[PDB]
Structure 1
Amino acid sequence: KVFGRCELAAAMKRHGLDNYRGYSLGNWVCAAKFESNFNTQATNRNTDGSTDYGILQINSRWWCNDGRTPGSRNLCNIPCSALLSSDITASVNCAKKIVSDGNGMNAWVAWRNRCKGTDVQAWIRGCRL
């Protein structure tokens, strides 16, 4: 599923991400935009063989099981395929665990490089929330 901007904002807010660990909704929407262009089915292979999945490009090296990432962990205790659903619950629940682990949203390199320190509220501007 390819979400609209405001559609994804509303879905994220309903799933508890708004100000989760202090990160306003615009931060999460901005991260999703540059990780996946709002496409739940996005996948991207990393150089070391792990794979990133879903709207927030969550990595099989640590967070989900895809059966093909040797030595990896599955700290969200989910199949990586769960991260590609039209329903964003698994991605949100895993993102909450990631952003709580110590480095906040810097875990998403694209958030650090493209969202951090910018006017992230622009990503929710105009949305009925």
Structure 2
Amino acid sequence: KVFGRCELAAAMKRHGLDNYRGYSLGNWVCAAKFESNFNTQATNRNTDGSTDYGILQINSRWWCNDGRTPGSRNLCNIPCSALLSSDITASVNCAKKIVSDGNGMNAWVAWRNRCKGTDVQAWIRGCRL
């Protein structure tokens, strides 16, 4: 499912991301934009053989199981498949764990390079929330 911008902001808010660990809603929408273009079925192979899945491109190296990432962990305790569904619950719950890991949203390299320090509120401009 490819979410609309304000549609994703609303689902993110409902799942408790708005100001989660101090990151306003616009940060999460911006990160999703650049990670997946708001497509829950986005996947991307990393150089090391792990794979990124879903709207926030969560990585099989630490966070989910895909049965094909040697020596990886499944710290969100989910199949990576779960991160591709129309229903964002699993991506949000796992993102909560990641953003809590000590590095905040810097865990998403695209958020650090494209969203961090920008006018992220722009991403939720005009949305009924």
- TM-score bracket relative to the smaller structure: over 0.9
C-alpha separation in 2, matches of 1:29 and 1:90: 16
- Give 2:21's aligned residue: 21
- Give 2:82's aligned residue: 82
The alignment's C-alpha RMSD in Å is 0.1
C-alpha separation in 2, matches of 1:65 and 1:122: 34
For residues 38-91 of structure 1, what are the alpha-carbon distances to aligned partners after superposition, in whole Å with 9 as ceiling and x for unaligned?
000000000000000000000000000000000000000000000000000000
C-alpha separation in 1, matches of 2:101 and 2:54: 20
Name the SS of the counterpart of 2:52 in structure 1: strand
How far 1:28 sits from its partner (Å)?
0.1
Determine what percentage of the aligned residue pairs are the same residue: 100
For residues 68-127 of structure 1, what are the alpha-carbon distances to aligned partners after superposition, in whole Å with 9 as ceiling and x for unaligned?
000000000000000000000000000000000100000000000000000000000000
C-alpha separation in 2, matches of 1:5 and 1:120: 13
C-alpha separation in 1, matches of 2:109 and 2:101: 15
Q: How many aligned positions are there?
A: 129
Structure 1: gaps spanning 5 or more residues: none
C-alpha separation in 1, matches of 2:67 and 2:93: 21
TM-score with structure 1 setting the length? 1.00
TM-score with structure 2 setting the length? 1.00
C-alpha separation in 2, matches of 1:6 and 1:22: 20
Runs (4+) of structure 1 exceeding 2 A deviation are none
C-alpha separation in 2, matches of 1:85 and 1:44: 16
